[PDB]
Ligand binder design. Structure first.
Ligand SMILES: O=c1[nH]c(=O)c2[nH]c(=O)[nH]c2[nH]1
Length: 470
């Protein structure tokens, strides 16, 4: 049904909206929570806090979000066998609310505990929310446009990040006080997802293979498709089902010891190890700090910051015309190299900062090129690259190895960024430059074209490089 198209859009809204929000909520109250941290550690552990460990306390406070995602990757392979798909999607609503109330209690109490452990309960909502959804929301009415749903998931991450700056302004909600409500505003998107979940009927391919409930399924497909002809669409979903139970689900550890995936387990991880160490997550995270040191005038940082996430939204909608026309190889490999030079130009601005008054205005232009290069370049392409990278026997095991490196890497970039700032001062992005160009070199010589080609030449092209032939 056409009316369900926006309902399904809302069904994918709160899960994607919330994950992006947590990446940008750090941005506005960054000095305010640190001052509130100062009121902590003197109340019970009475002594002034050394600045060396003060940054450590904030660094673990921000990076713990990634760790909750990592256990969110591991929780699926236990809970998924007995809990249902909507039932698992029902659970994160409870985790989101429980996480929010701990955040709302942050100023009610006088401790730092609830912020750290409470954000762990936000981290698990960065898990199953972005581990259930992306390959399991794929129940839009047309089955041929599913490539759009790849980017539809990605665009709402932009708004989730974008609303963080909007709701963190010095006029709307981000003040010296009322900062718990900046965290406490996360309730209303959660309940909206909770409100739409009963409104969303069910998962049409779940009840067919698990519950054996074809009588209710045919009514479900009429709700999604909105058409009377249903027999052809219910027979095709069983067509692949017999193939699924014919094939053997290969375990996780058998990949890391198989010689035919010697340079394929290590190349899927570095395709997305260069997704979090690409640095953009650091941009979103610590944006208030980094713009301040680049010669920017004070009292306007949030006033210019909206462009950091603004073009993220604009580039995402503009990415629809790029994927089909260019493919998946040249923009992925060309995206990293395009911004490898821009880090150098960024570092030129950050080093000088004084020769002209437009140098700080040149610094911000460098940042906007990085986001424009990213969403248009490597965006959701690594998510869908890995889908066709392996075959269907190891694909459910693909995200087991891919998810774990995703969040440990996100934990790595979040934890070590502030230490690099205080140590390397203005050359802090040189390390970020080395890793990103490394992805350009590594992926150039290994990855062939993947657009519009079936697995046969994907394997045959790789078999040459691998001398695989087991
Ligand atoms: O569409 C996205 N934009 C980002 O900024 C981002 N950061 C991340 O880790 N995953 C994504 N996905």
């Amino acid at each position: 049904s056409c009316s369900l198209l926006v309902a399904s859009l809302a069904g994918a809204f709160g899960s994607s909206f919330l994950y992006g929000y947590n990446l940008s909520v750090v941005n506005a109250p960054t000095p305010y929570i640190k001052a509130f941290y100062n009121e902590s550690w003197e109340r019970r552990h009475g002594r002034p806090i050394d600045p060396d460990t003060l940054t450590l306390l904030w660094s673990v406070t921000v990076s713990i979000f990634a760790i909750g995602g990592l256990v969110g990757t591991l929780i699926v392979k236990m809970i998924g066998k007995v809990l249902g798909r909507k039932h698992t999607l029902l659970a994160n609503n409870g985790f989101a609310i429980s996480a929010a109330l701990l955040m709302a209690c942050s100023l009610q109490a006088g401790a730092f505990e609830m912020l750290i452990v409470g954000r762990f309960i936000m981290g698990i909502d960065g898990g199953v929310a972005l581990s259930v959804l992306p390959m399991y929301l794929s129940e839009i009415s047309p089955k041929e446009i599913r490539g759009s749903l790849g980017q539809v998931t990605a665009i709402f991450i932009c708004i989730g990040v974008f609303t963080g700056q909007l709701l963190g302004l010095p006029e709307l909600l981000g003040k010296e006080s009322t900062w718990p409500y900046l965290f406490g505003v996360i309730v209303v998107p959660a309940v909206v997802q909770l409100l739409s979940l009963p409104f969303l009927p069910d998962s049409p391919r779940y009840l067919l293979l698990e519950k054996h409930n074809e009588a209710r399924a045919v009514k479900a497909f009429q709700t999604f498709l909105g058409k009377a002809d249903v027999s052809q669409e219910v027979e095709e979903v069983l067509a692949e089902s017999r193939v699924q139970r014919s094939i053997r689900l290969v375990s996780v550890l058998e990949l890391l010891r198989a010689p035919y995936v010697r340079w394929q387990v290590v190349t899927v991880i570095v395709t997305m190890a260069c997704y979090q160490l690409c640095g953009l997550n650091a941009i979103w995270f610590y944006t208030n700090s980094i713009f301040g040191k680049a010669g920017i005038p004070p009292a306007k940082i949030p006033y210019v910051t909206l462009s950091t996430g603004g073009i993220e939204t604009l580039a995402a909608v503009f990415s629809g015309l790029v994927i089909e026309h260019l493919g998946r190889r040249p923009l992925l490999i060309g995206g990293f190299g395009l911004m490898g030079l821009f880090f150098g130009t960024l570092t030129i601005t950050l080093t000088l900062q004084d020769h002209a008054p437009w140098v700080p205005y040149l610094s911000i232009v460098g940042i906007l090129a990085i986001i424009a290069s990213f969403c248009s370049g490597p965006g959701g392409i690594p998510f869908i690259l890995t889908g066709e990278f392996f075959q269907q026997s190891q694909r459910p095991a693909a995200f087991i190895i891919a998810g774990t490196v995703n969040w440990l890497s996100n934990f790595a970039v979040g934890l070590l960024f502030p230490f690099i700032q205080k140590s390397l001062d203005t050359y802090c992005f040189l390390v970020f430059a080395t890793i990103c160009i490394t992805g350009a070199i590594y992926l150039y010589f290994v990855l062939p074209e993947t657009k519009n080609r079936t697995y046969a030449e994907i394997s045959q092209a790789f078999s040459k490089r691998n001398k695989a032939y087991p």
